[PDB]
Design a protein around this ligand. Structure first.
Ligand SMILES: CCCCCCCCCCCCCCCCCC(=O)OC[C@H](COP(=O)([O-])OCC(O)COP(=O)([O-])OC[C@@H](COC(=O)CCCCCCCCCCCCCCCCC)OC(=O)CCCCCCCCCCCCCCCCC)OC(=O)CCCCCCCCCCCCCCCCC
Ligand SMILES: CCCCCCCCCCCCCCCCCC(=O)OC[C@H](COP(=O)([O-])OCC(O)COP(=O)([O-])OC[C@@H](COC(=O)CCCCCCCCCCCCCCCCC)OC(=O)CCCCCCCCCCCCCCCCC)OC(=O)CCCCCCCCCCCCCCCCC
Ligand SMILES: CCCCCCCCCCCCCCCCC[C@@H](O)O[C@H](CO[C@H](O)CCCCCCCCCCCCCCC)COP(=O)(O)OCC[N+](C)(C)C
Ligand SMILES: CCCCCCCCCCCCCCCCC[C@@H](O)O[C@H](CO[C@H](O)CCCCCCCCCCCCCCC)COP(=O)(O)OCC[N+](C)(C)C
Ligand SMILES: CCCCCCCC/C=C\CCCCCCCC(=O)OC[C@H](COP(=O)(O)OCCN)OC(=O)CCCCCCC/C=C\CCCCCCCC
Ligand SMILES: CCCCCCCC/C=C\CCCCCCCC(=O)OC[C@H](COP(=O)(O)OCCN)OC(=O)CCCCCCC/C=C\CCCCCCCC
Ligand SMILES: N[C@@H](Cc1ccc(O)cc1)C(=O)O
Lengths: 606, 178, 64, 458, 175, 56, 52
């Protein structure tokens, strides 16, 4: 019965088995991480088959297997979309997760709660698969919030440390700001198209209005950490290195971009939202690449690089090239995860040191890590015929040859120069020169888990671009004719960035000292954006929620008007009524007054 | 962290703290070792140039100017040791720290494992119970009538005494507990 | 104990109606309500007027 | 439906004839059996209600509420027996009698066919609650709380009574079926406006509506644990049930009489969510959470659409379970450290891991993580409000951001960080407390598995 | 299969092309699908055959319930409670059936959109038109009744629409 | 010896007995609302050759 | 939970689906519109005589 559907469902289903076994006598032993890693590897191998079927015949499906509930005219069912995006993303994510889990078997060996860590990693993977394969907006929202919560739990892994808890709550806050737009899109689609599934939404919206697309763009900006809601991604480096390599670099943070790739038929018919997406991506990639070039923590540099590449993906979506953006997601996963793993290897070798100013000459002391990091940097910069070339080069050429905002084009070119600049910074400060680490040398990368994981990701970073490009049907029209200088624009700007960064880094060897400029201060302190935006709005909100909502209104005026006034009035009237001297003279005079009044007021009128 | 603070810092203490801070931030600026050594020697010469100033007012004015210059020229992202209050591993292992009194609540089946450890624990508890009253008496004797004026505590002075208020210092969990 | 008591139970006994207290109470307890009432009433009046004229594009609007 | 009413009335003498050391066991066992029996009311029709007799009927709106009441009684019994160990036998039996009488009144309230019988039972629920609060509360403020609980209610309900009898002199009946079938529109006159207000304000103060909510933090903080459980889970839903019943005779006046209440609900939802961000008492935070969720329910009832009614039903059930669980979680820490200050005991995940898992799940359901029924109700109400006006997504959106914040804030304050050094009396969690948490949380996810049972008659 | 009516849920004749190999290399898809057949499809088929054999030895039936037609709300006197009750129940049943009709049409639309692939904008015109007509009729019948809907409010809505249409027709006649 | 057991656990029949009595009273209440049994326009039906009433 | 999961279909969802299937089949066979904007027959309705 056409094994496509059965295999696609089984790939997702078998990932949940260790979750069900987490209460057995394997979660209490030291064999649980290997069990989870083997399950993930088997899932990847199984998922390779539907990909082959699609590459042969272009086979696609939707499976609506379970009917959850039905409203009056709206039916909600558990449905999975098994189109090109799902069947291409699942093997890539599974391969990266396999490599990162094998890496974590070595990186987190001293953690007393490593089994919970693997259980956590698998839960994130399951939620991400639910997000990716969803066919209706409710299932997609389930995956959305699931990966958000898993990221919150994994960022605050060391929960006795204040900064980790702060970073986790910050990620939640920014993602909730995006979730507002997600919910707006859901409500608009249900009240205007009477559906939450993709098929009816595509049928009933030939010219989509602004509001649902703007909601989707807000959700994507939240999830992919675009300029307005960017700062949470670099702060998410508070978690362990495997979490950074898996969730916050290659798989989860592309989800927002993936969302816009899902709704590309609607975005194709709206010029204003496309322009907004393009400008947002351009400013994001420029700002993050500009922040990255002065950072001293290696994880911060790689995180800002990830944010800049997400901005480039948003730019690609903005010029109406969604398939190129998806291809770039797939290409970027490999070398970004490898770069994070190499950084983690360096950190573990140098007694958990993350500052590049205390990493000296590791080119000879750490040969395999040096080779992997060099290959990853070359792939990230779009060096010809590597994995990053087959997406980034085409993206740059498509941006050049389109009717587009000129400022966005300029910022894209400047950002793709700054990419090579910060890659040069990492390589120069971490691997070249003389040692700057403490004298007790414990450098050792001779461990089969680390070597095998990095080697797998390295083979991917070398060959995946060619393999995937030559095996997909063409969904776009190629830019066959271009001026030679515009064909070489990406290579030229990369070379200029390389040379300028090398010169400015070589100047550091001189015996000259000068106080920094204001531009350097702007770059290093992240445009002062976290300094102002995490102090002024938070202070005003909390101060108002104490002074006005709690004290002025709830504790004073709401008390004053209804209950306190009633108590005061009743008490005063009680004092007035009950305080009589008990002298018959006074109230017998009162009786006389009452009798006369009753004889005149009521009795005279009959 | 271990020493009891004083009521105020002296001029020499402030000068030395500024010297250490300036050298650390200069090392943050001067990444390479030889360049840092050169500029650190220059900084030391600049510091000991005005070492023999007998006028205290001029000394404090110089210190004020030096602190203003430091605040202007500080590295916005100085190097921090990973376990220092600003480091990447500052409070990483605090979630693994468990106070010792929790061991009193273990089920007897859990205590059936580790018999010798719990016998030693009982010995330590007996020692603490026997020493407490003498510690309190020594603190009562040694304290001035208007209450203590510093946070410094006395040592043991008698034959088999223990330094007062020692239990929670001696039975610290660990730096790497689990 | 003093902090929590001051933040909870000591507030009303130390409250006096003053021009500052009265003005801030009136503003922050009445202004938002009428602001949102005006916004929502204007929006719904516009929508109702559009519906009466028969130009709102209510096609496929089944669920409400 | 006497097959549910009579066994509770039998719980009464069974408790008063039990041996001194078997009261809790017998009460819990037979309460659970009564809940199992009441489970059969979920078999509902698509056209009309289950009309048992001239006096009692069951709808698709009241059956989940009855199931929740009967399920909450054993949980209250389990939560109460810890802090009542030192009590005398007679006073323990009196406490259990109060709980049983409250359950009986609620069961008869949710199924009464006539509005005056409903009113009588819905006022009769006041006495056991007030007695429980003012007799078994711990602090001196409980007395004041009791007064705030009483008059706030009665000042709303005394006008309603008048309106009710007036209606019976005009239409000749207060039977709900007759009232529904013989419905006539309300004209726009001052008399009709004041009739609308008399019919609405009692339920408004029961929800409670923002501005009329001051009784709730006092009553829900000063009460014993079972009192807080039953106040948050069931007694707040009396207002919503009564409003959804009474709105059938208020059209088309509601079309414009709802504006002040809608504005109050939305803005005060924002306000109470903000108040939760700066709260030093852990119980008061949960109370203000209840206020925000009930503001959402009020908006849903006021806009009068099928989607809003379904969302309101789901939200009431989900909130009942979640808020009861949160109150029990806070009570465990209070019984350990004898203080309600949130920052006193910190880093409890290091000392109590399974209780930390319970805390995480409860706070996840509070912020309406999908696909929980909390989220289903919230999303249905938000969609209906969006249809009512596209601008509401602003305020609702802000609420969704604030809720999670304070929810996680609570968790981060109690479970994470470092433990307080001088607190050395934190004993391991008892089997009773873990079982209480599980019996709260498992029905929530089970209901997620089959959500049409809590979606109401619409 | 025969489980559902193929006129209520129609499908196109399902044209699929024949394999046309152009390379001497073997097809991994064919080898993998042969393995999947032999290793998965046969044991499942045998289990289903056993289960169906067991089912055939115990064959019993259930029936679709039939409802006759009672007088509508239009034929009921103003205060006649029993006739109003029967008419209201009939109206609610009709409302549920209309909702299911809309659901069937929406299912057709969604299936056509998925089936037609890149040509859905042109190849799903008929299903879109059917959904447009059904949605317009359903919106005319039932929209804006609100919570606490009934047959009487539906009748009032229809009378109002009829009055407006009659007035518009007579005013256009005078043109 | 069953005397002590009975005098200690005779309170365990009160609630089941109440359940049975409530069921009986519900049947009695149903007995008083048969004015339209087999008389509605929707469900009116000819009697079987044996059965006396359509429902109890 | 088991008792609730297997509760018989008194909500008449399957009955309504089957009735709608029969109605759609009949109306599509005879070429009638699938649904009518009027749920009540106008011949049983008497409008007011005069609208002026
Ligand atoms: C051929 C056709 C194409 C033509 C292209 C253009 C032709 C020109 C070719 C070259 C152009 C650029 C050349 C390099 C630039 C200079 C680099 C540099 O670092 O100089 C040192 C100097 C500071 O050095 P430092 O402080 O001593 O370093 C600290 C230590 O070294 C600490 O050391 P460290 O270890 O920490 O490292 C510091 C770090 C970084 O050090 C820094 O922090 C300095 C940052 C400079 C690099 C930033 C470049 C990105 C520019 C984006 C701007 C977007 C608009 C922003 C607008 C702001 C609005 C306020 O150094 C690096 O890593 C290397 C930096 C980047 C090198 C690679 C350059 C590639 C990007 C730019 C060239 C693009 C090439 C292809 C173009 C393709 C287009 C078709 O930087 C500058 O002063 C110049 C920067 C330019 C800023 C201009 C903005 C205006 C400022 C005044 C505002 C006026 C206000 C008026 C009133 C308004 C009222 C409202
Ligand atoms: C999604 C995977 C599906 C797996 C298939 C089978 C799943 C069976 C689960 C059955 C229900 C769970 C029982 C609830 C009580 C918790 C147990 C406990 O007390 O711990 C003792 C037990 C003993 O371990 P221990 O060594 O003593 O350590 C205890 C320490 O305290 C520390 O322990 P810990 O550090 O290991 O943490 C305990 C754990 C347990 O805490 C929990 O959070 C579990 C409760 C769920 C969250 C409740 C609020 C969320 C609202 C969603 C409601 C979903 C319910 C669906 C229907 C459920 C039917 C009952 O929390 C977590 O690990 C992280 C929680 C983050 C979850 C994020 C996912 C959000 C939703 C994503 C998809 C959900 C819908 C699926 C379908 C979507 C469309 C395809 O802990 C465990 O064995 C691990 C718990 C397993 C985690 C389950 C999380 C995934 C399942 C979600 C719902 C199940 C859906 C099944 C349908 C098929 C799909
Ligand atoms: C702390 C929170 C407590 C709970 C909140 C309860 C909310 C209650 C608010 C009542 C909502 C509206 C009530 C009546 C509807 C309209 C009111 C009036 O302002 O509208 C105009 C009324 O016109 C003028 O405003 C006359 C009324 C002015 C006198 C009313 C006093 C209001 C002053 C504020 C006092 C605060 C009251 C609350 C005390 C706590 C409309 O013009 P008109 O078409 O002609 O009147 C419609 C009725 N007709 C058709 C029969 C004629
Ligand atoms: C500690 C370790 C934890 C992790 C390990 C767990 C190991 C695996 C176990 C987890 C199982 C995963 C759940 C996956 C769902 C499978 C079951 C599902 O398919 O059944 C549902 C059925 O679920 C039930 O319907 C929902 C349960 C009902 C909830 C009532 C709770 C009981 C009352 C308790 C007190 C009430 C308090 C709340 C008051 C409102 C589907 O219903 P339905 O689609 O129709 O079926 C159609 C066919 N039928 C109708 C013939 C049956
Ligand atoms: C354990 C392994 C068991 C091995 C033996 C069983 C092998 C197959 C048994 C087949 C049983 C028959 C069967 O499944 O028929 C389908 C039967 C009836 O059809 P319904 O769609 O449910 O009807 C509508 C009522 N809701 O459905 C079922 O009962 C099976 C349900 C399995 C669903 C898979 C799990 C997904 C649910 C997870 C929780 C999701 C929460 C809400 C998600 C919202 C998504 C929008
Ligand atoms: C026209 C007449 C209207 C009648 C309205 C009466 C409202 C019913 C409540 C009566 C409250 C009486 C309280 C009072 O006056 O005493 C002040 C009292 C003094 O305390 P004592 O207990 O008396 O002294 C003990 C120590 N020696 O001060 C207090 O602190 C009172 C505390 C409890 C008060 C609770 C009142 C809550 C009111 C909520 C709103 C209801 C108002 C009713 C009218 C609503 C408007 C239509
Ligand atoms: N009021 C709704 C309740 C419901 C919701 C979902 C269902 O699947 C069924 C019923 C009817 O129709």
């Amino acid at each position: 019965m056409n094994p496509f559907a059965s295999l696609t469902l089984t790939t997702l289903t078998i990932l949940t088995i260790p979750i069900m076994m987490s209460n057995s006598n394997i979660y209490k032993t030291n064999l649980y991480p290997n069990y989870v890693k083997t399950t993930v590897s088997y899932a990847f191998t199984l998922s390779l088959v539907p990909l082959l079927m699609f590459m042969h015949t272009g086979q696609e499906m939707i499976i609506s297997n379970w009917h959850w509930m039905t409203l009056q005219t709206v039916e909600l069912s558990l449905s999975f979309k098994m189109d090109y995006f799902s069947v291409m993303f699942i093997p890539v994510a599974l391969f990266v997760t396999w490599s990162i889990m094998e890496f974590s078997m070595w990186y987190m060996h001293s953690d007393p709660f490593i089994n919970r860590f693997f259980k956590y990693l698998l839960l994130f993977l399951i939620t991400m698969m639910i997000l990716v394969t969803a066919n209706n907006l409710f299932q997609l929202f389930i995956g959305w919030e699931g990966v958000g919560i898993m990221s919150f739990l994994l960022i605050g892994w060391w929960h006795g440390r204040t900064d980790a808890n702060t970073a986790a709550l910050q990620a939640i806050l920014y993602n909730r700001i995006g979730d507002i737009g997600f919910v707006l899109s859901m409500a608009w689609f249900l009240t205007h198209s009477n559906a939450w599934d993709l098929q009816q939404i595509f049928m009933l919206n030939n010219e989509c209005p602004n509001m649902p697309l703007i909601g989707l763009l807000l959700a994507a900006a939240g999830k992919s950490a675009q300029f307005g809601l960017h700062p949470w991604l670099p702060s998410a480096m508070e978690g362990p290195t495997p979490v950074s390599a898996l969730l916050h670099s290659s798989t989860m943070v592309v989800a927002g971009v993936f969302l816009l790739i899902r709704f590309y038929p609607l975005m194709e018919t709206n010029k204003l939202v496309q322009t907004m997406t393009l400008c947002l991506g351009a400013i994001t990639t420029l700002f993050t690449a500009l922040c990255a070039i002065t950072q001293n923590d290696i994880k911060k540099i790689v995180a800002f690089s990830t944010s800049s590449q997400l901005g480039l993906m948003m730019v690609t979506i903005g010029i109406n090239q969604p398939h190129l953006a998806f291809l770039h997601i797939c290409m970027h996963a490999f070398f970004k995860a490898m770069l994070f793993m190499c950084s983690g290897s360096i950190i573990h070798s140098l007694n958990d040191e993350q500052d590049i100013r205390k990493m000296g000459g590791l080119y000879k002391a750490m040969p395999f890590t040096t080779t992997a990091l060099i290959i990853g940097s070359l792939a990230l910069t779009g060096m010809p015929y590597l994995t990053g070339f087959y997406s980034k080069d085409l993206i740059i050429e498509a941006v050049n040859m389109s009717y587009t905002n000129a400022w966005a084009l300029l910022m894209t070119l400047i950002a793709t120069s700054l990419t090579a600049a910060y890659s040069t910074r990492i390589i120069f400060f971490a691997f070249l020169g003389k040692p700057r680490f403490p004298p007790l040398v414990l450098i050792n990368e001779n461990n089969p888990l680390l070597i095998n994981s990095i080697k797998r990701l390295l083979i991917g970073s070398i060959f995946a671009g060619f393999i995937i490009s030559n095996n997909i049907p063409p969904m776009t029209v190629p830019n066959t004719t271009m001026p030679l200088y515009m064909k070489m624009t990406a290579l030229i700007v990369t070379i200029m960035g390389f040379m300028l960064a090398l010169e400015l880094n070589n100047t550091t060897y001189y015996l000259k000292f000068k106080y920094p400029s204001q531009t350097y201060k702007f770059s290093n302190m992240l445009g002062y954006y976290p300094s102002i935006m995490h102090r002024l709005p938070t202070y005003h909100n909390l101060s108002m929620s104490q002074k006005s909502a709690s004290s002025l209104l709830d504790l004073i005026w709401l008390e004053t008007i209804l209950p306190k006034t009633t108590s005061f009035i009743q008490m005063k009237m009680s004092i007035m009524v009950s305080n009589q001297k008990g002298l018959i003279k006074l109230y017998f005079l009162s009786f006389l007054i009452t009798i006369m009044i009753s004889m005149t007021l009521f009795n005279y009128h009959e | 962290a271990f020493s009891a603070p004083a009521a105020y810092l002296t001029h020499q203490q402030k000068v030395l703290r500024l010297y250490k801070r300036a050298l650390r931030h200069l090392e943050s600026w001067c990444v390479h070792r030889d360049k840092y050594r050169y500029f650190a020697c220059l900084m030391r010469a600049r510091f000991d140039e005005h070492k023999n100033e007998k006028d205290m007012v001029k000394a404090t004015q110089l210190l004020r100017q030096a602190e203003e210059e430091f605040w202007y020229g500080q590295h916005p992202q100085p190097y921090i040791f990973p376990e220092s209050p600003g480091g990447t591993s500052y409070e990483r292992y605090e979630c693994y720290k468990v106070p010792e009194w929790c061991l009193d609540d273990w089920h007897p089946s859990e205590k059936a494992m580790y018999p010798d450890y719990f016998a030693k624990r009982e010995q330590w508890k007996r020692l603490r119970r026997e020493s407490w009253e003498r510690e309190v008496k020594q603190l009562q004797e040694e304290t001035p009538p208007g209450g203590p004026r510093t946070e410094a505590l006395p040592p043991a002075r008698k034959e088999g005494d223990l330094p007062p208020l020692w239990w929670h210092i001696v039975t610290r969990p660990r730096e790497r507990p689990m | 104990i003093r902090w929590t008591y001051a933040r909870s139970a000591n507030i009303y006994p130390n409250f006096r109606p003053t021009p500052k207290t009265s003005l801030l109470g009136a503003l922050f307890g009445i202004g938002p309500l009428f602001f949102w009432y005006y916004v929502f009433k204007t929006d719904r009046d516009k929508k109702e007027k559009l519906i009466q004229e028969g130009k709102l594009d209510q096609t496929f609007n089944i669920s409400y | 439906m006497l097959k549910i009413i009579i066994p509770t009335t039998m719980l009464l003498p069974m408790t008063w004839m039990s041996k001194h050391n078997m009261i809790w066991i017998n009460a819990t066992v037979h309460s659970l059996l009564i809940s199992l029996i009441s489970l059969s009311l979920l078999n509902q029709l698509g056209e009309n209600s289950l009309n048992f007799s001239l006096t009692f009927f069951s709808d698709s709106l009241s059956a989940p509420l009855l199931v929740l009441t009967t399920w909450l009684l054993p949980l209250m019994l389990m939560a109460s027996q810890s802090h009542l160990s030192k009590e005398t036998t007679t006073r323990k039996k009196l406490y259990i009698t109060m709980l049983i009488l409250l359950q009986l009144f609620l069961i008869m309230t949710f199924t009464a066919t006539e509005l005056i019988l409903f009113y009588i039972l819905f006022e009769a629920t006041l006495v056991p609650t007030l007695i429980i609060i003012t007799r078994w509360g711990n602090q001196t403020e409980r007395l004041n709380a009791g007064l705030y609980f009483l008059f706030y209610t009665l000042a709303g309900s005394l006008p309603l009574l008048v309106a009710l009898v007036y209606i019976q002199n005009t239409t000749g009946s207060l039977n709900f079926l007759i009232i529904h079938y013989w419905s006539h529109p309300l004209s726009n006159s001052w008399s009709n406006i004041f009739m609308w207000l008399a019919c609405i304000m009692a339920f408004m103060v029961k929800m409670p509506l923002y501005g009329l909510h001051l009784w709730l933090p006092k009553a829900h903080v000063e009460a014993p644990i079972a009192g807080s459980m039953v106040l948050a889970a069931v007694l707040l839903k009396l207002g919503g049930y009564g409003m959804m019943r009474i709105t059938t005779i208020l059209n088309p006046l509601t079309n414009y009489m709802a504006y002040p209440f809608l504005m109050l609900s939305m803005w005060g939802m924002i306000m109470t969510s903000s108040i939760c961000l700066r709260q030093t008492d852990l119980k008061s935070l949960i109370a203000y959470s209840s206020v925000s969720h009930m503001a959402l329910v009020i908006v849903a009832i006021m806009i009068q659409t099928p989607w809003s009614f379904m969302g309101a039903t789901a939200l009431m059930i989900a909130h009942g379970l979640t808020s009861s669980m949160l109150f029990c979680l806070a009570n465990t820490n209070y019984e350990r450290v004898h203080s309600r200050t949130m920052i006193l005991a910190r880093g409890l995940q290091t000392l109590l891991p399974l209780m930390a898992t319970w805390w995480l799940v409860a706070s996840l359901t509070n912020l309406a993580l999908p696909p929980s029924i909390n989220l289903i109700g919230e999303l249905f109400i938000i969609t209906a409000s969006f249809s009512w006006s596209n601008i509401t997504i602003i305020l609702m959106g802000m609420n969704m951001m604030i809720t999670a914040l304070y929810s996680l804030y609570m968790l981060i304050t109690t479970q994470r960080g470092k433990y307080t050094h001088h607190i050395n009396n934190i004993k391991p969690s008892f089997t009773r407390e873990n079982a209480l948490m599980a019996l709260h949380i498992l029905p929530l996810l089970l209901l997620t598995l089959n959500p049409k049972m809590i979606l109401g008659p619409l | 299969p025969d489980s559902w009516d193929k006129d209520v849920y129609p499908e196109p004749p399902r044209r699929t092309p024949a394999p046309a190999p152009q390379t001497s290399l073997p097809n991994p898809v064919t080898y993998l699908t042969k393995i999947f057949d032999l290793l998965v499809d046969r044991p499942v088929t045998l289990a289903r055959e056993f289960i169906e054999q067991q089912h055939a030895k115990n064959r019993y039936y259930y029936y679709h319930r039939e409802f006759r037609r009672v007088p509508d709300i239009t034929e009921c006197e103003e205060k006649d409670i029993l006739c109003m009750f029967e008419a209201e129940m009939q109206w609610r049943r009709d409302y549920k059936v209309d909702q299911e009709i809309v659901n069937i049409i929406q299912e057709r639309l969604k299936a056509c959109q998925q089936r037609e692939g890149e040509s859905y904008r042109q190849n799903c015109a008929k299903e879109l038109e059917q959904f447009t007509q059904v949605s317009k009729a359903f919106q005319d019948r039932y929209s804006d009744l609100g919570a606490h809907y009934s047959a009487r409010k539906c009748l009032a809505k229809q009378k109002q629409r009829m009055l407006a249409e009659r007035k518009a027709a007579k005013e256009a006649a005078a043109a | 010896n069953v005397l002590q057991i009975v005098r200690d656990h005779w309170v365990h029949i009160l609630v089941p007995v109440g359940f049975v009595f409530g069921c009986y009273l519900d049947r009695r209440s149903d007995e008083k609302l048969t004015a339209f049994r087999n008389k509605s326009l929707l469900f009116k039906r000819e009697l079987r050759p044996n059965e006396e009433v359509t429902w109890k | 939970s088991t008792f609730v999961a297997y509760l018989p279909d008194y909500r008449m969802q399957e009955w309504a689906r089957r009735e709608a299937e029969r109605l759609v089949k009949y109306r599509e066979a005879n070429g009638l519109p699938l649904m009518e904007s009027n749920c009540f027959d106008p011949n049983k309705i008497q409008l007011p005589e005069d609208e002026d």
